[PDB]
């Protein structure tokens, strides 16, 4: 129930605003900046602001705060969803998220904002549909929005029907300083870049534990994702009835399904860190990394970030494999490795001095995280069975998909 949504700047100047209900005066945006400054200075800053009886919910964007003033107790979740959709639409239309594009495409920006929502109720949410009706460089509204099938525009013609899938794996490991991993969750991501002719209805099929149990084939390696979320085009009725993933694929790259379940397997990388820091004399970095993944898998672009001292200077690195660079902006040493074969064991020995003057205040102990990304590895063991590509005209599709394993929340608590 936001009264009006506006785009602000880092200096407090509003890049663009669009009133939807008119129940709140436009001058309330000025008081938002002092309120935000006070909240940040007092630790009471929150995304949902409140200026008296009018709430100005703001979201920190790439360059400006997306302030959405509201008057009544409207759907806060709905307002957040509308703001996220607007951000996604702006990112799709404008490749840059800064003040340069805010003041460069205002003519089309105003039309897009007007078409997006009216009277506080969002109406248009398809980026492709918005581009087919609002362009920066007008015809009647497309019938796809009026029709039920708003996730697959009809009439698409392509020379070849190629779909690029991406099996993105996110391994998040929360290892405490005591050596025990508390939060070990793996989140799947089934994103497909479908580029074909027409609006084929995808018939997803994979080696799911629930599907195998229902079909009686619950004896092989079946992925039992704790949380699986279907895309907009995915038909939830088939999934609820018999796990039938039947939906119209979108024109382009989209995330159809995203698995999310806990992980009970050993970590892909076992990192042992040693802090031989003298009392204002020297610092020791006994970093040992062990690759617990299969030797047949190589972690490309491995970056294990080891936080160095805030006031540390004159550091010397004694490692075996992988370049180590101390970033003054990062104030930490990142164990950069180009390719990390599975089972590799890297030992590092840091040595640097410390200032004679003691620090006035403590800086905390940020966790140590790695940036490993080993593709072509399916740790979960979930294997896609088939993709039912059905077209009324009839064509032979050649879909493609790649499994990518990366390091997500693989943060290890510091000692």
């Amino acid at each position: 129930s936001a009264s009006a949504v506006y785009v602000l700047d880092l200096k407090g100047k509003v890049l663009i605003c669009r009133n939807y209900r008119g129940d709140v005066d436009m001058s309330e945006v000025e008081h938002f900046m002092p309120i935000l400054m006070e909240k940040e200075e007092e630790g009471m800053l929150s995304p949902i602001l409140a200026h008296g009886g009018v709430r100005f919910m703001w979201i920190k964007h790439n360059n400006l705060y997306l302030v959405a003033t509201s008057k009544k107790n409207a759907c806060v979740s709905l307002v957040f969803s509308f703001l996220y959709k607007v951000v996604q639409v702006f990112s799709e239309y404008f490749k840059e998220l800064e003040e340069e594009s805010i003041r460069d495409n205002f003519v089309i920006i105003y039309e897009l904002l007007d078409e997006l929502m009216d009277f506080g109720y969002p109406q248009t949410t398809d980026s492709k549909i918005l581009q087919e009706y609002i362009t920066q460089e007008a015809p009647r509204p497309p019938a796809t929005v009026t029709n039920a099938v708003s996730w697959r525009s009809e009439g698409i013609k392509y020379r070849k029907n190629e779909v690029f899938l991406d099996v993105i794996e996110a391994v998040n490991l929360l290892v405490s300083a005591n050596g025990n991993v508390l939060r070990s969750e793996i989140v799947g991501s089934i994103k497909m870049r479908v580029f074909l002719s027409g609006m084929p209805e995808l018939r997803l099929g994979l080696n799911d534990k629930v599907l195998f149990d229902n079909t009686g084939r619950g004896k092989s390696k079946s992925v039992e994702l704790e949380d699986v979320k279907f895309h907009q085009c995915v038909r939830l009725s088939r999934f609820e009835n018999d796990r039938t993933i039947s939906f119209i694929p979108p024109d382009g790259e989209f995330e159809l399904m995203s698995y999310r379940l806990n992980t009970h397997v050993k970590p892909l990388i076992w990192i042992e860190s040693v802090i031989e820091k003298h009392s204002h004399s020297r610092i020791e970095y006994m970093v040992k990394a062990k690759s617990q993944f299969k030797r047949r898998s190589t972690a490309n672009n491995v970056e294990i970030h080891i936080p160095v001292p805030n006031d540390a200077d004159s550091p010397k690195f004694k490692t075996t494999v992988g370049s180590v660079k101390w970033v003054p902006e990062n104030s930490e040493i990142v164990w950069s490795v180009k390719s990390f074969p599975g089972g590799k064991e890297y030992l590092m020995r840091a040595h640097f001095g410390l200032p004679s003057v003691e620090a006035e205040d403590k800086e905390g102990k940020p966790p140590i995280s790695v940036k490993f990304e080993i593709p072509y590895f399916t740790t979960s063991g979930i294997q896609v069975r088939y993709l039912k590509i059905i077209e009324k005209s009839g064509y032979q599709a050649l879909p493609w998909v790649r499994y990518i394993t990366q390091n997500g929340d693989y943060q290890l608590r510091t000692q």
Partner: peptide, 18 residues
């Protein structure tokens, strides 16, 4: 080639499930 796992051909459905 491409980093992060090469693209592989996908089937249409489980042929063993009828």
């Amino acid at each position: 080639d491409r980093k992060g796992g090469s693209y592989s051909q996908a089937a249409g459905s489980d042929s063993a499930q009828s």
